[PDB]
Design a protein around this nucleic acid. Structure first.
Ligand SMILES: [Zn+2]
Ligand SMILES: [Zn+2]
Ligand SMILES: [Zn+2]
Length: 88
DNA sequence: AGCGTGGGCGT
DNA sequence: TACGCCCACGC
C-alpha cells in the first residue's frame, strides 16, 4: 500500500506514490528546484513557489464570506483559520 | 496576521 | 513524470 520507502538516515517515512517520496526527500537534501523570478528565493516545491509569488503582487483570491467583513487572503488555509475565528 | 513548508490527495 | 489543490503546524 505504501511501497515507496525513505531510506535516509534515521528516517522511516513511506509513501503510496513515488512522487511523494521524491518530494519528501528534498527535505533531507535541501534541494530547491524552483526559483522566484522576482526575488530569486528558491523553493522545494512548485506549488509553494506559486503561493509565495502572491506575496509580491498582493493577490488574495480567498474572501471571507462573513457579511460586512472585507478580509481576503492569499491562501485557502488562511481563510479557513479566519472563518474558524468568526464562529468561535 | 502572513507565510514557509511539511502532509495527503486529485488529476 | 507534471501541476496544483486543501490541510495543518510552527514560527
Ligand atoms: Zn525521509
Ligand atoms: Zn519572491
Ligand atoms: Zn471575516
Amino acid at each position: 500500500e505504501k511501497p515507496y520507502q525513505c531510506d535516509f538516515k534515521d528516517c522511516e517515512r513511506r509513501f503510496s506514490r513515488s512522487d511523494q517520496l521524491k518530494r519528501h526527500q528534498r527535505r533531507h537534501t535541501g534541494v530547491k528546484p524552483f526559483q522566484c523570478k522576482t526575488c530569486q528565493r528558491k523553493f522545494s516545491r512548485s506549488d509553494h513557489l506559486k503561493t509565495h509569488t502572491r506575496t509580491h503582487t498582493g493577490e488574495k483570491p480567498f474572501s471571507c464570506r462573513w457579511p460586512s467583513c472585507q478580509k481576503k487572503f492569499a491562501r485557502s488555509d488562511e481563510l479557513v483559520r479566519h472563518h474558524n475565528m468568526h464562529q468561535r
